[PDB]
Amino acid sequence: LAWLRVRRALTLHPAPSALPPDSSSPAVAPELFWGTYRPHVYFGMKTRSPKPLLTGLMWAQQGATPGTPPKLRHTCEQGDGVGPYGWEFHDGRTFGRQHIHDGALRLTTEFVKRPGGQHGGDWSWRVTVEPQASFPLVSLFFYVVTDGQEVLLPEIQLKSISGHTSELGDFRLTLLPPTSPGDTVPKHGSYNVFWSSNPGLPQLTDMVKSRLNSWFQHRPPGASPDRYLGLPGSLKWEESGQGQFLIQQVTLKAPFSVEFVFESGSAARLVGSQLTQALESHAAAFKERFEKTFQLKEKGLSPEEQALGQVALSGLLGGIGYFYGQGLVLPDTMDPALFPPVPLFSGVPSRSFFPRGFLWDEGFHQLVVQRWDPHLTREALGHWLGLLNADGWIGREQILGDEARARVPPEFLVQRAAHANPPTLLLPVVHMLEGHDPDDLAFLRKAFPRLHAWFSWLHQSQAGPVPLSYRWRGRDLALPTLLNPKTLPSGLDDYPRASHPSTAERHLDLRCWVALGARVLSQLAEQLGETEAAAELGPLAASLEEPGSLDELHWAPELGVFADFGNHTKAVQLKSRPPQGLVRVVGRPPPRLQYVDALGYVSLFPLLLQLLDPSSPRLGPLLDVLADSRHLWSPFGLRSLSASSLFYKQRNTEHDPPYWRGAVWLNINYLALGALHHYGHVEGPHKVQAAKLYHELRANVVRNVRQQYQATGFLWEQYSDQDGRGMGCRPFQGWTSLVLLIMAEEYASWS
Ligand SMILES: *[C@@H]1O[C@H](CO)[C@@H](O[C@@H]2O[C@H](CO)[C@@H](O)[C@H](O)[C@H]2NC(C)=O)[C@H](O)[C@H]1NC(C)=O
Numbered sequence: 001l002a003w004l005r006v007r008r009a010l011t012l013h014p015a016p017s018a019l020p021p022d023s024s025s026p027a028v029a030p031e032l033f034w035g036t037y038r039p040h041v042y043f044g045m046k047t048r049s050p051k052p053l054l055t056g057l058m059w060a061q062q063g064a065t066p067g068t069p070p071k072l073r074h075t076c077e078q079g080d081g082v083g084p085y086g087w088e089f090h091d092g093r094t095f096g097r098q099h100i101h102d103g104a105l106r107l108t109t110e111f112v113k114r115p116g117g118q119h120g121g122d123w124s125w126r127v128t129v130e131p132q133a134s135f136p137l138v139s140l141f142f143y144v145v146t147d148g149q150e151v152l153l154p155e156i157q158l159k160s161i162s163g164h165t166s167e168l169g170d171f172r173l174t175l176l177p178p179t180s181p182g183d184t185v186p187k188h189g190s191y192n193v194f195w196s197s198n199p200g201l202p203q204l205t206d207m208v209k210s211r212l213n214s215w216f217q218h219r220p221p222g223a224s225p226d227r228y229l230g231l232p233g234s235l236k237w238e239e240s241g242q243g244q245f246l247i248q249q250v251t252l253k254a255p256f257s258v259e260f261v262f263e264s265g266s267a268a269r270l271v272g273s274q275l276t277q278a279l280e281s282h283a284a285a286f287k288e289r290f291e292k293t294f295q296l297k298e299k300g301l302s303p304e305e306q307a308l309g310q311v312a313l314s315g316l317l318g319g320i321g322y323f324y325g326q327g328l329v330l331p332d333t334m335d336p337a338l339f340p341p342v343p344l345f346s347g348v349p350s351r352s353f354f355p356r357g358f359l360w361d362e363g364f365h366q367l368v369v370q371r372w373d374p375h376l377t378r379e380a381l382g383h384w385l386g387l388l389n390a391d392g393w394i395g396r397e398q399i400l401g402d403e404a405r406a407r408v409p410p411e412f413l414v415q416r417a418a419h420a421n422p423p424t425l426l427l428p429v430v431h432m433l434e435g436h437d438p439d440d441l442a443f444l445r446k447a448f449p450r451l452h453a454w455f456s457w458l459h460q461s462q463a464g465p466v467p468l469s470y471r472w473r474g475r476d477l478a479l480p481t482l483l484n485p486k487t488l489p490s491g492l493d494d495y496p497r498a499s500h501p502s503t504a505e506r507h508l509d510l511r512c513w514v515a516l517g518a519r520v521l522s523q524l525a526e527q528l529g530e531t532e533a534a535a536e537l538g539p540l541a542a543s544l545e546e547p548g549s550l551d552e553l554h555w556a557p558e559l560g561v562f563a564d565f566g567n568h569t570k571a572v573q574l575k576s577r578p579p580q581g582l583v584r585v586v587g588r589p590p591p592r593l594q595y596v597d598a599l600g601y602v603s604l605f606p607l608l609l610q611l612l613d614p615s616s617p618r619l620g621p622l623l624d625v626l627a628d629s630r631h632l633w634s635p636f637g638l639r640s641l642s643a644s645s646l647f648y649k650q651r652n653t654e655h656d657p658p659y660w661r662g663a664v665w666l667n668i669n670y671l672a673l674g675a676l677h678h679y680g681h682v683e684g685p686h687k688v689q690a691a692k693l694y695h696e697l698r699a700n701v702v703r704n705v706r707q708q709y710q711a712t713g714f715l716w717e718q719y720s721d722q723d724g725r726g727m728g729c730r731p732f733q734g735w736t737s738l739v740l741l742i743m744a745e746e747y748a749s750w751s
């Protein structure tokens with residue numbers, strides 16, 4: 001009855017899978033079985049499996065202040081003192097090179113994957129420790145974590161570790177003796193080791209910290225000895241069927257390099273000189289492929305801009321993760337419920353975040369990935385489409401497994417089945433259609449019922465008060481602490497909308513996403529021969545493209561822009577009231593139904609998504625507000641909100657700083673650049689002005705992102721509209737990677 005609808009919200013969609021039957025098994029995808037699929041860990045690997053084999057690195061500098069134990073490094077915590085760091089090279093498949101700056105130390109973490117056998121092949125790591133341009137004493141830790149009943153067989157001094165799993169068969173792990181960098185001659189190292197049952201992945205750091213409780217002596221030949229904190233000096237199992245954890249510690253004076261090798265039984269050497277040769281061959285092949293794909297040198301980009309592009313791509317491919325588990329869901333009508341267990345293969349917005357998937361970020365990530373490797377995009381889109389419930393909903397934030405949950409109470413992990421997110425997954429679909437590649441076409445043929453179910457859910461679940469209008473569900477519940485209720489499902493969290501939320505609201509950005517989605521899917525339906533779907537999608541796209549209805553619903557003549565509508569008053573302020581603290585004060589005039597004055601990214605949506613005809617009477621006015629220094633035009637790109645707005649740089653609460661209230665964001669700037677490139681290249685009365693603004697905006701965005709990367713070593717979440725400085729989270733790779741597509745002038749066109 002009502003309980004049948006609840007189970008529907010918590011059931012996987014019955015349509016055919018967009019991915020082959022056992023898509024992640026090494027029999028089907030051998031090249032992708034192993035990888036750097038744990039983005040929140042500085043350096044580690046895992047298999048694309050629900051019961052994976054995990055590896056990782058930890059490090060600590062010895063000679064630290066007493067009473068105060070050394071800082072142990074393992075996960076990418078934004079305030080741990082490490083930085084800058086990031087991938088210089090990573091092709092998302094065979095190799096990678098990363099640099100980590102940590103106080104007096106510089107670390108180089110490199111890997112090469114070698115195919116062979118029936119279980120996903122082999123891999124080798126090289127970790128180089130050098131002093132910052134001092135011979136500091138350093139401990140490196142190399143661990144392995146098994147699943148359930150799987151056991152490890154050591155080879156004692158600790159030479160190697162052998163194992164067996166259903167998915168990997170027989171395998172061997174070897175920690176080779178250290179050498180000096182660029183040489184094969186062995187150097188003396190001190191060894192410690194810990195071995196017991198796996199305490200859980202978010203508990204590895206604390207378990208190691210707890211067992212670094214006894215002093216030892218590093219005794220190299222021809223040198224004075226050094227004291228260090230370590231794990232037990234000899235191998236002894238410590239006393240539940242939750243898998244095993246074995247961590248090996250190596251300590252000596254920098255500079256040195258140490259190799260950690262994985263060898264598959266079925267594949268039966270990638271070490272020293274052969275590993276050095278493999279690394280150089282991979283780096284050269286990467287550079288050749290990068291120029292052919294993006295043609296930056298041919299397009300006249302500087303060597304510095306070329307280096308920026310290379311890092312933009314490497315950081316994005318380096319942040320691709322594999323997740324498995326049950327998410328928390330709140331059905332629309334109630335208590336939270338578990339969703340069925342599912343896998344997810346996806347890019348992440350920041351390595352500094354708990355390892356999670358974000359729905360509208362992924363559409364932007366895949367625009368970059370598809371240009372480099374179309375197969376990776378098919379894998380990622382196929383996995384996101386596997387998350388649909390029987391109604392066509394996908395949770396906007398995917399928190400799957402223990403590390404992703406990261407000790408946050410379940411109350412803050414729950415995804416609401418009533419709430420949406422922009423359908424940016426359709427943007428890489430436009431490019432796949434344009435290229436007419438047979439593999440992309442065969443994938444889209446299989447994926448069509450899922451893409452259609454998901455789109456249909458969006459315009460039906462978010463229907464507005466009148467025909468052809470839409471309203472984002474999930475605006476914050478009006479509280480005395482909130483200046484303006486946020487719209488978290490829209491992606492632009494604190495962009496100002498109506499002061500007093502109600503069911504009479506009409507949202508401009510959402511209407512525009514629906515118009516684009518209907519157009520993209522009608523084009524796909526026509527290409528595939530989906531007659532009945534095309535007969536529905538075609539007329540819906542035309543009804544939403546139409547200028548009369550858009551004008552009636554969103555054109556605000558008193559504002560000279562397109563706007564959101566609702567019960568609103570500009571007379572709202574945050575004021576301190578003892579004993580209350582800082583609270584919102586509604587003054588005069590009282591709220592009434594009208595268009596909302598909030599000139600910014602939302603105002604531009606018919607232009608950004610290329611919905612206006614080149615001869616539209618509304619195109620000129622939008623171009624003028626975009627170009628105006630008093631509004632959106634800053635020397636570093638387009639502002640999220642007008643500098644003349646009463647909400648400009650305004651905090652929403654005592655604990656909530658401005659977010660989409662002035663700062664420059666690279667995803668929306670990329671869409672504006674695609675739109676200006678479009679209007680500047682088609683015939684029309686504003687072609688000249690659009691072509692000019694395109695060149696000026698491109699120059700400003702590229703320059704600032706390049707300069708901030710030079711000054712900080714990072715690509716940031718957002719940029720200051722006043723001085724261009726990187727702000728928010730970092731590394732943000734992440735849609736800030738779109739800077740590569742801006743430099744290459746690669747924009748997907750849906751006309
Ligand atoms: C716009 O918002 C105002 C402010 O909340 C609404 O006024 C409230 O209306 C309800 C229902 O009549 C009353 O119980 C409250 O006392 C009113 N509050 C105040 C402070 O006047 C108003 O109804 C809303 N208008 C529309 C069209 O939704």
Ligand SMILES: COCCCCCCCCCN1C[C@H](O)[C@@H](O)[C@H](O)[C@H]1CO
Pocket residue numbers: 349352353354356358360361491492493
């Ligand atoms: C310590 O790790 C914390 C991990 C979880 C953070 C959860 C909050 C996500 C904030 C980041 N970000 C806010 C933007 O306004 C959205 O448009 C965007 O989709 C989203 C994801 O990039």
